Write a protein that binds this DNA or RNA. Structure first.
Ligand SMILES: [Mg+2]
Lengths: 123, 119, 209, 56, 114
RNA sequence: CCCGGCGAGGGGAGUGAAAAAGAACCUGAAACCGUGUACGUACAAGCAGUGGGAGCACGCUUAGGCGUGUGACUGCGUACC
RNA sequence: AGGACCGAACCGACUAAUGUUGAAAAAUUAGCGGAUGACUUGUGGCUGGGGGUGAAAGGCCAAUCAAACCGGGAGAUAGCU
RNA sequence: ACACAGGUGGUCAGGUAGAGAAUACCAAGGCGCUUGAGAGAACUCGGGUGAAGGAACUAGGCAAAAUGGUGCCGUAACUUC
RNA sequence: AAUUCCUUGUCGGGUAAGUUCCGACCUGCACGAAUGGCGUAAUGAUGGCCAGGCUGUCUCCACCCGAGACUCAGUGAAAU
RNA sequence: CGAUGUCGGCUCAUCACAUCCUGGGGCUGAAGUAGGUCCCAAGGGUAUGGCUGUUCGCCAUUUAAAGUGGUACGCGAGCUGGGUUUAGAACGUCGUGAGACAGUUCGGUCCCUAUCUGCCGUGGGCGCUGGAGAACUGAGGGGGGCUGCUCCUAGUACGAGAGGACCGGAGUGGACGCAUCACUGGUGUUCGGGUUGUCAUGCCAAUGGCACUGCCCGGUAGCUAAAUGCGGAAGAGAUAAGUGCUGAAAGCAUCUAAGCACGAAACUUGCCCCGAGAUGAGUUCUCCCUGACCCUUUAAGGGUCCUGAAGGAACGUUGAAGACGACGACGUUGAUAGGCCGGGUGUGUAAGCGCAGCGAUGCGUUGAGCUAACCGGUACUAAUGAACCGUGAGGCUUAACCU
């Protein structure tokens, strides 16, 4: 459950450390955002030399939420980090190639098959 | 709303509510019958009748219980020595409610609450 | 097609074999006993008046039981009437089991909602509160403006204002039937039916086909 | 926040049209002491449903 | 009630191992993909248990990839398959909310033995 | 003298020309508020009247005829300075 | 040592809410500042209205101040309502 | 103007915690603040708690939240040192 | 510029976005040297801008505790 | 001018159509895709922030779109007081000056308990022509009406390729609204634990009081969203724009004049809800009352005694019902409430004793002790014998049967 003006975590080797969402996507007035979702974010913090840079504006996918997501048995999988993974603005696919930390089955798709392939642990 | 709830506020906060029913039960058991309001009547049903049910076992632990409830050894005495063995067979219903009309100075609906085995 | 009489036994969840927790609501459907069959000749409309259950015999009245006695059937806990669909006939003394719903998939639960008392407008009509700070005096949950300056200079019919919310006839539609326990006269349906536990309910089939 | 006319005293009766009191319907007779009292209340003499419920 | 619990008792799983909070446990859950019902493990520390019969549940916390993964497990769910107490634990409080963040040194729980 | 709290206040009883002179006391207007009678009044829109007028009630009476009170219905009609 | 520091009393009155037919003709509540000094306070004393006094703001001079209050001219005057 | 949350000068200084006339609980001592009795809608007053988010709110981080003790370690720009 | 009309001047900073601020630029409508000028540590319930912390400020409110509101009894205004 | 407060915001709006998305056409300098334009169509929908008091605008990034106006530039007896617009103060500027500047800057009291209309609720009266109790009927009125994306058809029609459809279908969203607490949570100052200071219980032990619930950690019921069910229709009818059919007037032609069709989120419906104060008070079913008499102004009249039904009301216990009313359930025959019993729940191994240990403490007894609203029971208490109300067969006029 991520709204805008929320700091997140960069869960890969894309180069950034601290980002913040500026736009929930996928429909007008969509208030909050969960996993498997595409959001337009800034970059507040990147490494001294990386693939990305401070202040860059691009899309990302959310992979870990503090609030957690549910399963059809009723079970919920909560994390301790509102953490996300960058994407391309246009080809809509990630930048880094080393996923940091575990992910969910709600990420897997034909869309993010690449990422879960690079994932260290899939819940 | 107050759906499926319980308890009565009595226009008092809980520290007043708790310290009152301490002195209300301590007064009652001392005389087995007092005069009070019908609202204060029906809730003291839910106070002393478990204390009577507590009086059906005199453990020295339960000697500590009622003094923790009341801070009055005399009532702790009187429950266990007398009221315990008195009401020792009754499956609840240790009291009786006598709505006795209205109070003079304010039109308040008074009641008499007594014990069953009082005579 | 006719509906049947239920009662909100309570909400629960059914696990499937496959790890899917379906929240259903337990509703019992007793022997729904037909009482009066309204017609075209006397009444102009085909409808069966039914009952189910029973009540205290010292509480049923002489006008009431004589209606049952004319039917020659046990006094229920209440009377209900369903408009008969055509080609669907019944006798007077017939009772009806839950097994009519053995073939449905979606049904409609008709029930009196819970009673929420005198609701506030923000609660009743999903309004916005005003600011709780930045200078607001005494207007933290008021609805603010209600009309206009003088040219339609009144308040209009059907204005969203405060009042009783709930305690009334609502009907959630298209609810999936899950299990028809004809053995102990029960019914499992996915969803959250109106009203509180033990309130009586009306289960018709789905109105949207 | 105040009247722009004066209300008629005819309205004042109509305002007080529902403000009437209500007398007691019947009085419960004590079956033993004979006297009357409120239904579901004790007598003025400590009797209720016949018996001496309280020596006052 | 008398009828509600009749439908709950016919769905509770009989193979439930009893334990306490603070007990390091393993859970084997089902994972289906394509037709591959693989039985994926999960393992960590019970921080809380919710006891409501058929609706009973609990919560297992682990520290995976340096991150605190919490999955609340419904007890009688069919999709969990095995619960295995790998280690009991000597806690006092009934629910371990402070162990959502007490990590490293203060992540330690001493093992119950009575 | 009776009610009442030994009250308050009243009711007798007496006084006096008179107490509808009783001391909150000549006379008691209006506003205001009663209580009773009459008639009207619970599908009906507006300075509240007026004009017409059903009925009821009611007085003379010769209940004819009318007075009186009420105003069913209806025409007309937007206070005053 | 200090128109030194923190901080009670004390002395303020900064912010916000309340209150606004108020508990109150200016206050309460919560925080606020100063708090050995150009401090604060008791008891007196003095300065009088075109005058006083004023770390000045027309500020203050008995709930009154760009000219205090009271009495007198005085039934000021009013091409106005 | 009130049996009015205001104002009013001096004196007296128990115990425990506590640097303290801070507080916090008490003693001595004095009270329970002149309508109650219920009910436990909205709304308002005063409060407490809050998933995820963390100022985006807004004129404005107003208000709230938060910080806060002692001992020790440590401490920039600049400085009129 | 507490002074700049034009004017959201231009450039730079900052922000994703900055009619604000900050630093330049001087084209100073209509700076200016004791009605001082330009600086300045310290100071400030001083103005504006930025961050961290912080959180019902907001998203989007939800619940509960008291005080009223409401019922009854006694009392019993107001302005218009 | 004996007072009609205005900028902007906020909270609530509502209307128009001169239509932004959506819907339907026509033409194209419309291959398709994408458009252009005009017509029909107002049912629904129709951003957030940076900036500045703003409005506006600029910008960032969304949407399917980010319609335009009317409403005292809607909306202060609803809010805000930033802008404007009091007194304080300063600069620029002007004036000798006092002063002033649609020059700027700093600071700068937002009263109103609702009589009426109104509106949302909820009642009482009376009526509906014997009384009563239910079932309704459904006049009318209200709710509701959004859309994305993905896939299929199919990389097909089209197209040189690039690109890429119609139509038809599916799946999933967003936004909204309803139901709701099974789940996820929150709350849960009535349950349990922890802990500080102090006071008290003769004292220890053990408690309690007070310290924002003293400070915490938890947490039942309920209430709750962020939790999760469902909704938006399909269909019908008449249509708008528009497309036609046959076809004269007018030997042709012509959608029109006769006749016939098609045609849109608009309309009527169809869905939900209200609903006989629908005075036009409707319908159905049930139940109850079958006395004596006088009186005169005979009258749809006055009274007396007899009778008091169905039932209703009142009373009590009460509710997931509730401001109060109203509504529901129960009142001994009885589970209505309380207690009780069993449970469950949460809390987390009580106290007491034993043990170890100088002791703090730890271990044993011990998932102990306890447990709010809960589950199942239990009449143990409180739900009284009454009494009350409401009566005694129900006007006239026809007709239509039957006598
Ligand atoms: Mg009244």
């Amino acid at each position: 459950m991520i709204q805008e003006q929320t700091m997140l975590n960069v869960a890969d080797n894309s180069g950034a450390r601290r980002v913040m969402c500026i736009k929930v996507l996928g429909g007008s007035h969509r208030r909050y955002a969960g996993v498997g979702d595409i959001i337009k974010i800034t970059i507040k913090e990147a490494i001294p030399r990386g693939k990305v840079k401070k202040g860059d504006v691009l899309k990302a996918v959310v992979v870990r939420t503090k609030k957690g997501v549910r399963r059809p048995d009723g079970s919920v999988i909560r994390f301790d980090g509102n953490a996300c993974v960058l994407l391309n603005n246009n080809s809509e696919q990630p930048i880094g190639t080393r996923i940091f930390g575990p992910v969910t089955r709600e990420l897997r798709s034909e869309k993010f098959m690449k990422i879960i392939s690079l994932a260290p642990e899939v819940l | 709303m107050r759906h499926r709830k319980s308890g009565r506020q009595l226009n008092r906060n809980s520290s007043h509510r708790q310290a009152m029913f301490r002195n209300m039960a301590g007064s009652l058991v001392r005389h087995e019958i007092i005069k009070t309001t019908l609202p204060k009547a029906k809730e003291l049903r839910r106070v002393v009748e478990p204390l009577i049910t507590l009086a059906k076992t005199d453990s020295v632990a339960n000697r500590r219980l009622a003094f923790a409830r009341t801070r009055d050894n005399e009532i702790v005495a009187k429950l266990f020595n007398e009221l315990g063995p008195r009401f020792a067979s009754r499956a609840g219903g240790y009291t009786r409610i006598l709505k006795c009309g209205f109070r003079a100075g304010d039109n308040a609906p008074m009641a008499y609450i007594e014990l069953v085995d009082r005579s | 097609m006719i509906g049947l009489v239920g009662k909100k036994v309570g909400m629960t969840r059914i696990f499937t074999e496959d790890g899917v927790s379906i929240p259903v609501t337990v509703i019992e459907v007793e022997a729904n006993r037909v009482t009066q069959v309204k017609d075209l000749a006397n009444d102009g409309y085909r409808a069966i008046q039914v009952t189910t259950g029973a009540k205290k015999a010292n509480r049923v009245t002489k006008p009431e039981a004589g209606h049952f006695a004319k039917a020659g059937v046990e006094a229920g806990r209440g009377l209900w009437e369903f408009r008969l669909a055509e080609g669907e006939e019944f006798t007077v003394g017939q009772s009806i089991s839950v097994e009519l719903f053995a073939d449905v998939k979606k049904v409609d639960v008709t029930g009196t909602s819970k009673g929420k008392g005198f609701a506030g407008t923000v609660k009743r009509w999903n309004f916005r509160t005003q600011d709780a700070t930045h200078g607001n005096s005494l207007s933290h949950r008021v609805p603010g403006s209600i009309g206009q300056n003088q040219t339609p200079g009144k308040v209009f019919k059907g204005k969203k204002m405060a009042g009783q919310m709930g305690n009334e006839r609502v009907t959630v539609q298209s609810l999936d039937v899950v299990r028809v326990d004809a053995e102990r006269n029960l019914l499992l349906v996915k969803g959250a039916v109106p009203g509180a536990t033990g309130s009586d309910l009306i289960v018709k089939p789905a109105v949207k086909a | 926040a105040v009247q722009q006319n004066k209300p008629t005293r005819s309205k004042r009766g109509m305002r007080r049209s529902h403000d009437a009191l209500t007398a007691v319907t019947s009085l419960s007779v004590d079956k033993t002491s004979g006297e009357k009292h409120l239904r579901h209340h004790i007598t003025a003499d400590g009797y209720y449903r016949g018996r001496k419920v309280i020596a006052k | 009630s008398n009828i509600i619990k009749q439908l709950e008792q016919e769905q509770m799983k009989q193979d439930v191992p009893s334990f306490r909070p603070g007990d390091t446990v393993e859970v084997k859950v089902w994972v289906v993909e394509g037709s591959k019902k693989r039985l994926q493990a999960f393992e960590g520390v019970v921080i809380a248990i919710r006891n409501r019969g058929l609706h009973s549940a609990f919560t297992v916390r682990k520290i995976s990839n340096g991150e605190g993964v919490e999955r609340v497990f419904q007890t009688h769910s069919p999709v969990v398959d095995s619960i295995s107490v790998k280690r009991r634990g000597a806690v006092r409080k009934a629910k371990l909310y402070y162990l959502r963040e007490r990590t490293g040194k203060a992540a330690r729980i001493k093992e119950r033995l009575n």
